[PDB]
Short mmCIF file of C-alpha atoms in Angstrom, two decimals:
data_model
loop_
_atom_site.label_atom_id
_atom_site.label_comp_id
_atom_site.label_asym_id
_atom_site.label_seq_id
_atom_site.Cartn_x
_atom_site.Cartn_y
_atom_site.Cartn_z
CA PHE B 6 -47.28 -17.34 12.91
CA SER B 7 -45.25 -17.09 9.70
CA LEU B 8 -42.36 -14.89 8.65
CA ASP B 9 -42.95 -15.25 4.90
CA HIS B 10 -45.96 -13.03 4.42
CA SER B 11 -45.86 -13.17 0.60
CA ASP B 12 -46.84 -16.84 0.65
CA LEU B 13 -49.94 -15.95 2.66
CA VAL B 14 -50.69 -13.22 0.17
CA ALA B 15 -50.35 -15.55 -2.79
CA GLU B 16 -52.85 -18.02 -1.28
CA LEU B 17 -55.22 -15.12 -0.48
CA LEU B 18 -55.02 -13.79 -4.05
CA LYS B 19 -55.61 -17.25 -5.32
CA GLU B 20 -58.78 -17.70 -3.28
CA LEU B 21 -60.13 -14.24 -4.00
CA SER B 22 -59.63 -14.82 -7.75
CA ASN B 23 -62.74 -16.98 -7.51
CA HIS B 24 -65.17 -14.17 -8.27
CA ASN B 25 -68.86 -15.03 -7.81
CA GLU B 26 -67.90 -18.44 -6.40
CA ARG B 27 -66.64 -20.09 -3.19
CA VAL B 28 -68.37 -17.62 -0.92
CA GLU B 29 -67.41 -19.19 2.40
CA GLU B 30 -63.81 -19.81 1.38
CA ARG B 31 -63.55 -16.23 0.15
CA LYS B 32 -65.03 -14.84 3.35
CA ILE B 33 -62.31 -16.67 5.26
CA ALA B 34 -59.65 -15.17 2.97
CA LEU B 35 -61.17 -11.67 3.36
CA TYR B 36 -61.24 -11.95 7.14
CA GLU B 37 -57.66 -13.21 7.03
CA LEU B 38 -56.73 -10.09 5.04
CA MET B 39 -58.50 -7.95 7.62
CA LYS B 40 -56.47 -9.56 10.41
CA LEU B 41 -53.17 -8.91 8.60
CA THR B 42 -54.03 -5.26 8.20
CA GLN B 43 -53.98 -4.90 11.99
CA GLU B 44 -50.56 -6.48 12.34
CA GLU B 45 -47.39 -4.55 13.02
CA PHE B 47 -46.89 -6.05 8.27
CA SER B 48 -44.27 -6.12 5.49
CA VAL B 49 -46.97 -7.25 3.04
CA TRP B 50 -47.82 -3.73 1.88
CA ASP B 51 -44.58 -2.55 0.29
CA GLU B 52 -44.70 -5.47 -2.11
CA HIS B 53 -48.37 -6.34 -2.41
CA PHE B 54 -50.45 -3.21 -1.75
CA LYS B 55 -51.43 -2.62 -5.37
CA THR B 56 -52.22 -6.25 -6.07
CA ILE B 57 -54.44 -6.63 -3.02
CA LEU B 58 -56.23 -3.35 -3.48
CA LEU B 59 -57.13 -3.88 -7.13
CA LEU B 60 -58.41 -7.40 -6.43
CA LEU B 61 -60.45 -6.07 -3.48
CA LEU B 62 -61.91 -3.28 -5.62
CA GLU B 63 -62.87 -5.83 -8.26
CA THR B 64 -64.52 -7.86 -5.47
CA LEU B 65 -66.85 -4.87 -4.80
CA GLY B 66 -68.70 -5.94 -7.91
CA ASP B 67 -69.32 -9.51 -6.71
CA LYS B 68 -72.81 -10.88 -7.21
CA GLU B 69 -72.95 -11.96 -3.54
CA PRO B 70 -74.12 -9.12 -1.18
CA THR B 71 -72.30 -10.53 1.83
CA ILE B 72 -69.08 -10.56 -0.22
CA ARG B 73 -69.50 -6.95 -1.36
CA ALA B 74 -70.25 -5.92 2.19
CA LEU B 75 -67.24 -7.73 3.59
CA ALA B 76 -64.89 -6.42 0.89
CA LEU B 77 -65.88 -2.87 1.98
CA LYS B 78 -65.06 -3.70 5.60
CA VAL B 79 -61.64 -4.93 4.52
CA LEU B 80 -61.15 -1.81 2.35
CA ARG B 81 -62.02 0.32 5.40
CA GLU B 82 -59.22 -1.26 7.39
CA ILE B 83 -56.66 -0.85 4.65
CA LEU B 84 -57.68 2.82 4.39
CA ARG B 85 -57.20 3.57 8.06
CA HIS B 86 -53.91 1.64 8.40
CA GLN B 87 -52.21 2.48 5.08
CA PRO B 88 -53.66 5.84 3.97
CA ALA B 89 -50.41 7.12 2.39
CA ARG B 90 -50.43 4.25 -0.08
CA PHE B 91 -53.67 5.35 -1.73
CA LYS B 92 -52.00 8.39 -3.33
CA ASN B 93 -52.25 7.07 -6.90
CA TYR B 94 -55.51 5.18 -6.36
CA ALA B 95 -57.58 7.84 -4.65
CA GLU B 96 -59.94 8.61 -7.55
CA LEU B 97 -60.64 4.91 -8.07
CA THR B 98 -61.05 4.07 -4.41
CA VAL B 99 -63.38 7.01 -3.72
CA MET B 100 -65.54 6.25 -6.77
CA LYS B 101 -65.94 2.60 -5.88
CA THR B 102 -66.74 3.42 -2.28
CA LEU B 103 -69.36 6.03 -3.35
CA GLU B 104 -70.83 3.73 -5.96
CA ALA B 105 -71.53 1.11 -3.30
CA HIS B 106 -73.95 3.63 -1.75
CA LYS B 107 -76.57 2.79 -4.39
CA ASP B 108 -76.51 -0.95 -3.59
CA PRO B 109 -80.01 -2.40 -3.12
CA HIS B 110 -78.78 -4.26 -0.04
CA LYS B 111 -78.84 -2.23 3.17
CA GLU B 112 -75.92 -4.20 4.64
CA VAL B 113 -73.77 -3.21 1.68
CA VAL B 114 -74.82 0.46 1.90
CA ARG B 115 -74.03 0.42 5.63
CA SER B 116 -70.58 -1.07 5.04
CA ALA B 117 -69.98 1.54 2.33
CA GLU B 118 -70.96 4.39 4.67
CA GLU B 119 -68.56 3.07 7.28
CA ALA B 120 -65.81 2.87 4.64
CA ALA B 121 -66.58 6.36 3.34
CA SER B 122 -66.34 7.70 6.84
CA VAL B 123 -62.83 6.30 7.37
CA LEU B 124 -61.74 7.35 3.90
CA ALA B 125 -62.57 10.96 4.80
CA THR B 126 -60.53 10.83 8.05
CA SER B 127 -57.55 8.94 6.58
CA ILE B 128 -56.91 10.00 2.96
CA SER B 129 -54.95 13.22 2.36
CA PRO B 130 -57.57 15.93 2.84
CA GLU B 131 -56.45 18.14 -0.06
CA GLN B 132 -56.41 15.28 -2.52
CA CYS B 133 -59.78 13.98 -1.36
CA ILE B 134 -61.43 17.41 -1.90
CA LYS B 135 -59.91 17.56 -5.38
CA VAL B 136 -61.09 14.10 -6.26
CA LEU B 137 -64.60 14.79 -4.96
CA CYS B 138 -65.16 18.04 -6.90
CA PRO B 139 -65.87 16.56 -10.37
CA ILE B 140 -67.94 13.77 -8.82
CA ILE B 141 -70.13 16.24 -6.95
CA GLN B 142 -70.64 18.21 -10.19
CA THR B 143 -71.42 15.28 -12.48
CA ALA B 144 -72.31 11.96 -10.73
CA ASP B 145 -75.84 10.54 -10.59
CA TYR B 146 -78.02 10.50 -7.53
CA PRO B 147 -77.30 9.27 -4.90
CA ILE B 148 -73.57 9.07 -5.60
CA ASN B 149 -73.32 12.91 -5.75
CA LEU B 150 -75.12 13.03 -2.40
CA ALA B 151 -72.57 10.71 -0.77
CA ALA B 152 -69.70 12.72 -2.35
CA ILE B 153 -70.98 15.97 -0.83
CA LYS B 154 -71.29 14.33 2.57
CA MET B 155 -67.70 13.07 2.22
CA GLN B 156 -66.49 16.54 1.19
CA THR B 157 -68.07 17.98 4.32
CA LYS B 158 -66.16 15.53 6.52
CA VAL B 159 -62.91 16.31 4.75
CA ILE B 160 -63.41 20.11 5.00
CA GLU B 161 -63.62 19.83 8.78
CA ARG B 162 -60.05 18.51 8.76
CA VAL B 163 -58.22 21.35 6.99
CA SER B 164 -56.94 24.74 8.14
CA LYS B 165 -58.49 28.03 7.00
CA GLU B 166 -55.46 28.68 4.79
CA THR B 167 -55.78 25.29 3.18
CA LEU B 168 -59.51 25.59 2.63
CA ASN B 169 -59.17 29.10 1.16
CA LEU B 170 -56.85 27.57 -1.46
CA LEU B 171 -59.38 24.84 -2.30
CA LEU B 172 -62.54 26.96 -2.28
CA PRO B 173 -62.48 27.85 -6.00
CA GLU B 174 -62.66 24.10 -6.77
CA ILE B 175 -65.19 23.42 -4.00
CA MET B 176 -67.66 26.26 -4.50
CA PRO B 177 -69.06 25.54 -8.00
CA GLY B 178 -70.43 22.12 -7.02
CA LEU B 179 -72.11 23.44 -3.92
CA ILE B 180 -73.70 26.41 -5.73
CA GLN B 181 -74.97 24.05 -8.40
CA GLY B 182 -75.99 21.36 -5.86
CA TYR B 183 -78.05 23.92 -3.92
CA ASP B 184 -80.30 24.02 -7.03
CA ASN B 185 -80.48 20.22 -7.36
CA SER B 186 -83.92 18.63 -7.78
CA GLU B 187 -83.28 16.32 -4.84
CA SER B 188 -84.04 17.72 -1.41
CA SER B 189 -81.31 15.59 0.13
CA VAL B 190 -78.72 17.01 -2.27
CA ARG B 191 -79.76 20.61 -1.47
CA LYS B 192 -79.59 19.86 2.24
CA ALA B 193 -76.13 18.26 1.97
CA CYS B 194 -74.89 21.36 0.19
CA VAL B 195 -76.30 23.59 2.94
CA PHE B 196 -74.61 21.40 5.52
CA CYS B 197 -71.36 21.65 3.57
CA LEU B 198 -71.62 25.42 3.34
CA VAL B 199 -72.31 25.53 7.08
CA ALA B 200 -69.08 23.61 7.63
CA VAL B 201 -67.12 26.03 5.41
CA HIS B 202 -68.62 28.98 7.30
CA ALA B 203 -67.52 27.51 10.63
CA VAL B 204 -63.96 27.62 9.29
CA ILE B 205 -63.78 30.88 7.35
CA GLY B 206 -66.76 32.86 8.76
CA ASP B 207 -67.71 36.00 6.84
CA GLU B 208 -64.95 35.30 4.28
CA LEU B 209 -67.49 32.85 2.78
CA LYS B 210 -69.87 35.65 1.71
CA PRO B 211 -68.27 36.81 -1.60
CA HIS B 212 -68.31 33.18 -2.75
CA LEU B 213 -72.10 33.23 -2.39
CA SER B 214 -72.98 36.11 -4.74
CA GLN B 215 -74.92 33.77 -7.08
CA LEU B 216 -77.43 32.71 -4.41
CA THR B 217 -80.98 34.11 -4.35
CA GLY B 218 -82.20 35.79 -1.18
CA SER B 219 -84.39 32.80 -0.40
CA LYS B 220 -81.44 30.45 -0.61
CA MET B 221 -79.39 32.86 1.50
CA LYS B 222 -82.14 32.90 4.13
CA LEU B 223 -82.23 29.10 4.36
CA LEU B 224 -78.44 28.91 4.63
CA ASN B 225 -78.41 31.60 7.31
CA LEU B 226 -81.05 29.65 9.22
CA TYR B 227 -78.94 26.49 9.24
CA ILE B 228 -75.88 28.53 10.07
CA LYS B 229 -77.78 29.87 13.07
CA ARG B 230 -79.05 26.39 14.03
CA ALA B 231 -75.54 24.94 14.04
CA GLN B 232 -74.44 27.85 16.21
CA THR B 233 -77.17 27.31 18.82
CA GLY B 234 -78.67 23.86 19.38
CA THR R 5 -39.72 -62.84 101.51
CA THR R 6 -43.45 -62.10 101.77
CA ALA R 7 -42.86 -58.59 100.44
CA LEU R 8 -40.89 -60.27 97.68
CA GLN R 9 -43.82 -62.62 97.08
CA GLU R 10 -46.29 -59.78 96.97
CA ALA R 11 -44.12 -57.83 94.52
CA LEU R 12 -44.05 -60.91 92.30
CA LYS R 13 -47.84 -60.97 92.33
CA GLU R 14 -47.94 -57.25 91.59
CA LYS R 15 -45.56 -57.69 88.68
CA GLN R 16 -47.81 -60.46 87.30
CA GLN R 17 -50.73 -58.04 87.51
CA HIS R 18 -48.75 -55.44 85.58
CA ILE R 19 -47.92 -58.11 82.97
CA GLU R 20 -51.58 -59.02 82.52
CA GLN R 21 -52.48 -55.37 82.10
CA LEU R 22 -49.71 -54.79 79.53
CA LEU R 23 -50.86 -57.86 77.56
CA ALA R 24 -54.28 -56.18 77.28
CA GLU R 25 -52.89 -52.74 76.42
CA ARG R 26 -50.66 -54.30 73.77
CA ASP R 27 -53.53 -56.16 72.19
CA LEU R 28 -55.92 -53.20 72.44
CA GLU R 29 -53.37 -50.97 70.72
CA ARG R 30 -53.03 -53.51 67.94
CA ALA R 31 -56.80 -53.40 67.51
CA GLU R 32 -56.42 -49.64 66.85
CA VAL R 33 -53.79 -50.13 64.15
CA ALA R 34 -56.21 -51.86 61.81
CA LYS R 35 -58.92 -49.36 62.77
CA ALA R 36 -56.75 -46.30 62.00
CA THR R 37 -55.54 -47.82 58.71
CA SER R 38 -59.16 -48.35 57.60
CA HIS R 39 -60.00 -44.81 58.68
CA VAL R 40 -57.55 -43.67 56.04
CA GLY R 41 -59.76 -45.21 53.35
CA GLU R 42 -62.91 -43.72 54.84
CA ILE R 43 -61.53 -40.16 54.81
CA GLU R 44 -60.10 -40.73 51.34
CA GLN R 45 -63.60 -41.53 50.12
CA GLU R 46 -64.98 -38.57 52.02
CA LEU R 47 -62.52 -36.46 50.02
CA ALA R 48 -63.44 -38.20 46.78
CA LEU R 49 -67.13 -37.42 47.31
CA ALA R 50 -66.41 -33.83 48.38
CA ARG R 51 -64.51 -33.11 45.15
CA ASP R 52 -67.41 -34.61 43.17
CA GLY R 53 -69.74 -32.36 45.10
CA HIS R 54 -67.44 -29.43 44.37
CA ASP R 55 -67.45 -30.06 40.62
CA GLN R 56 -71.23 -30.51 40.45
CA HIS R 57 -71.70 -27.23 42.29
CA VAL R 58 -69.44 -25.43 39.86
CA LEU R 59 -71.47 -26.88 37.00
CA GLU R 60 -74.72 -25.58 38.54
CA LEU R 61 -73.30 -22.04 38.96
CA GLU R 62 -71.90 -22.07 35.43
CA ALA R 63 -75.34 -23.02 34.11
CA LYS R 64 -76.89 -20.00 35.83
CA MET R 65 -74.19 -17.81 34.34
CA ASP R 66 -75.10 -19.25 30.92
CA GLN R 67 -78.73 -18.31 31.50
CA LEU R 68 -77.77 -14.75 32.46
CA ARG R 69 -75.47 -14.42 29.45
CA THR R 70 -78.33 -15.32 27.17
CA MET R 71 -80.34 -12.48 28.74
CA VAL R 72 -77.46 -10.04 28.29
CA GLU R 73 -77.15 -11.05 24.63
CA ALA R 74 -80.86 -10.58 24.03
CA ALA R 75 -80.72 -7.11 25.55
CA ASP R 76 -77.77 -6.21 23.31
CA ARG R 77 -79.69 -7.38 20.25
CA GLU R 78 -82.63 -5.20 21.25
CA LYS R 79 -80.35 -2.24 21.99
CA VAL R 80 -78.75 -2.39 18.54
CA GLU R 81 -82.25 -2.57 17.02
CA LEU R 82 -83.50 0.46 18.99
CA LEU R 83 -80.38 2.50 18.23
CA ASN R 84 -80.93 1.76 14.53
CA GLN R 85 -84.56 2.84 14.80
CA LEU R 86 -83.54 5.99 16.64
CA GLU R 87 -81.05 6.91 13.92
CA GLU R 88 -83.79 6.26 11.34
CA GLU R 89 -86.23 8.56 13.14
CA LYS R 90 -83.62 11.28 13.52
CA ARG R 91 -82.99 11.20 9.75
CA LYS R 92 -86.78 11.50 9.16
CA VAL R 93 -86.85 14.62 11.37
CA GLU R 94 -83.85 16.13 9.61
CA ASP R 95 -85.32 15.60 6.10
CA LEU R 96 -88.76 16.82 7.06
CA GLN R 97 -87.39 19.83 8.96
CA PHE R 98 -85.46 21.00 5.88
CA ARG R 99 -88.50 20.59 3.62
CA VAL R 100 -90.69 22.63 6.01
CA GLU R 101 -88.06 25.37 6.36
CA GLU R 102 -87.60 25.43 2.61
CA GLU R 103 -91.36 25.51 1.93
CA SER R 104 -91.92 28.29 4.46
CA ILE R 105 -89.39 30.51 2.70
CA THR R 106 -90.93 29.90 -0.71
CA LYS R 107 -94.32 30.87 0.81
CA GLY R 108 -92.81 34.08 2.18
CA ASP R 109 -91.04 34.70 -1.14
CA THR M 5 -33.75 -63.90 98.85
CA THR M 6 -31.58 -64.33 95.82
CA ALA M 7 -33.89 -66.73 93.92
CA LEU M 8 -36.97 -64.56 94.54
CA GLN M 9 -35.02 -61.51 93.46
CA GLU M 10 -34.00 -63.43 90.33
CA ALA M 11 -37.62 -64.29 89.49
CA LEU M 12 -38.50 -60.64 90.01
CA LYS M 13 -35.77 -59.62 87.56
CA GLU M 14 -37.23 -61.97 84.93
CA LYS M 15 -40.75 -60.68 85.41
CA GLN M 16 -39.36 -57.17 85.11
CA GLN M 17 -37.72 -58.19 81.82
CA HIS M 18 -41.05 -59.62 80.67
CA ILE M 19 -42.59 -56.23 81.60
CA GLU M 20 -39.89 -54.42 79.61
CA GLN M 21 -40.61 -56.60 76.63
CA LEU M 22 -44.38 -55.96 76.74
CA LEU M 23 -43.85 -52.19 77.14
CA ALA M 24 -41.82 -52.31 73.98
CA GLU M 25 -44.38 -54.45 72.12
CA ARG M 26 -47.14 -52.12 73.27
CA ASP M 27 -45.17 -49.03 72.20
CA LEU M 28 -44.55 -50.53 68.75
CA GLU M 29 -48.29 -50.97 68.28
CA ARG M 30 -48.81 -47.36 69.46
CA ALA M 31 -46.23 -46.12 66.98
CA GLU M 32 -48.20 -47.96 64.26
CA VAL M 33 -51.40 -46.29 65.36
CA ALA M 34 -49.49 -42.97 65.23
CA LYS M 35 -48.28 -43.46 61.66
CA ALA M 36 -51.78 -44.32 60.45
CA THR M 37 -53.19 -41.34 62.35
CA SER M 38 -50.69 -38.97 60.71
CA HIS M 39 -51.68 -40.37 57.31
CA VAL M 40 -55.29 -39.62 58.27
CA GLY M 41 -54.15 -36.12 59.23
CA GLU M 42 -52.67 -35.52 55.79
CA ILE M 43 -55.97 -36.51 54.17
CA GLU M 44 -57.94 -34.28 56.53
CA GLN M 45 -55.58 -31.47 55.59
CA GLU M 46 -56.30 -32.05 51.90
CA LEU M 47 -60.04 -32.05 52.55
CA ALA M 48 -60.03 -28.74 54.46
CA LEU M 49 -57.92 -27.26 51.65
CA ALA M 50 -60.32 -28.49 48.99
CA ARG M 51 -63.28 -26.99 50.82
CA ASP M 52 -61.37 -23.74 51.29
CA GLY M 53 -60.39 -23.62 47.59
CA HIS M 54 -63.95 -24.49 46.63
CA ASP M 55 -65.51 -21.78 48.84
CA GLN M 56 -63.23 -19.15 47.30
CA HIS M 57 -64.09 -20.46 43.84
CA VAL M 58 -67.80 -20.17 44.58
CA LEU M 59 -67.36 -16.56 45.70
CA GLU M 60 -65.61 -15.77 42.42
CA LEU M 61 -68.44 -17.39 40.48
CA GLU M 62 -71.15 -15.70 42.53
CA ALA M 63 -69.38 -12.34 41.96
CA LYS M 64 -69.50 -12.96 38.19
CA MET M 65 -73.17 -13.93 38.49
CA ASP M 66 -73.97 -10.67 40.29
CA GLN M 67 -72.06 -8.71 37.69
CA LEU M 68 -74.17 -10.24 34.95
CA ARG M 69 -77.38 -9.56 36.89
CA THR M 70 -76.37 -5.92 37.26
CA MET M 71 -75.65 -5.84 33.49
CA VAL M 72 -79.16 -7.08 32.73
CA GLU M 73 -80.67 -4.47 35.06
CA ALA M 74 -78.60 -1.68 33.48
CA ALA M 75 -79.63 -2.87 30.03
CA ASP M 76 -83.33 -2.77 31.03
CA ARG M 77 -82.99 0.86 32.15
CA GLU M 78 -81.14 1.81 28.95
CA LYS M 79 -83.92 0.21 26.94
CA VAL M 80 -86.52 2.40 28.65
CA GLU M 81 -84.30 5.43 28.01
CA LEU M 82 -84.00 4.57 24.32
CA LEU M 83 -87.74 3.92 24.00
CA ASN M 84 -88.47 7.36 25.48
CA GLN M 85 -86.06 8.95 23.03
CA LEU M 86 -87.69 7.12 20.17
CA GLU M 87 -91.12 8.33 21.24
CA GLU M 88 -89.87 11.90 21.39
CA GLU M 89 -88.41 11.66 17.87
CA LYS M 90 -91.64 10.09 16.56
CA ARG M 91 -93.64 13.03 17.99
CA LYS M 92 -91.38 15.43 16.08
CA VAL M 93 -91.79 13.45 12.87
CA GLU M 94 -95.55 13.40 13.32
CA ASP M 95 -95.71 17.13 13.98
CA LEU M 96 -93.55 17.88 10.91
CA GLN M 97 -95.59 15.47 8.79
CA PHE M 98 -98.82 17.36 9.32
CA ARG M 99 -97.00 20.69 8.73
CA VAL M 100 -95.98 19.53 5.28
CA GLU M 101 -99.61 18.65 4.46
CA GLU M 102 -100.49 22.20 5.56
#
């Protein structure tokens, strides 16, 4: 019920500075931060950076329930203040993707939920651009999650916008289709299916480096997505 | 004079009857006042009966809510298992389609 | 006749007095009876309010019962779906080992 929101922020920052400690107190602070994010708040103009960078640090906490909750909070900041992530997109994406290799299923689940919102909230062009080097160079299963994110983002852009991004997008998918991991090859097929649904036959000249066998498999999934 | 004497006797009879009616009405005054307390208590007990009844119904609603909660826990569990199975199918399906092409190739 | 008529007037005045005494006692009975009536009025109103309150509760009870029944049907639906998916997995499993 307070007007002065900065005071609330200061006490939240203070509590959350207690990395690897005070788990219950920090859960309260995190939930408090979640609540604020819903509120119609003047916090963000002054404190967005400070909150975000402390929350991203908190992703590395030793306590699983803290990492998981920090990702839930991040998810809400993403869907309510997407414009503010302009200069922190690379960082925020990487941290969200990295959480996908957590040994704790609850943390991976929270990261998948965050990744989903990130893809529907962040500027689509910028997201695709950020994801391209990650898809080409990150370790399994971070590259996998990046491809899945790229797919979600591609479904949000116009044909004209996608055509402009395709030279950045295509190399990772061509290379991913040869990846040793079945899940990475499948994600790339799924991503190519989603491109096809936007640009149709225009996709074909981008695929000149594929073998016949890889073309067959892509055409099969193209045909499966068209039917049932 | 005799008619005057008889009316005097009649008026005495009326007097004796009004003495009785007066006293019998007074008997009712106490009786009605005490009836107030009896119906007050009847009300007191009724409200206690009302509150107990509400408590019994609320208990049964508690029981039902526990059943609803259990069913929601099981539903979340089954929906998780179903998502798990669907991912198994998707992964296996791709491997079989991929292996079939390599065999044809 | 005048002295007999005078006695009759006095007895009549005694009568008038007793009518008034009797009517004062009646008025007392009336007051107490009206106070009883106000309590009876409260009691009928309490019962009425209670009966309506019980209907509201019983309607909530039935709503919860119908939620449990719906949940039981959805569980059977989900179990069937699960079994179908498991058959697919099993069929694909033995096609990989082929």
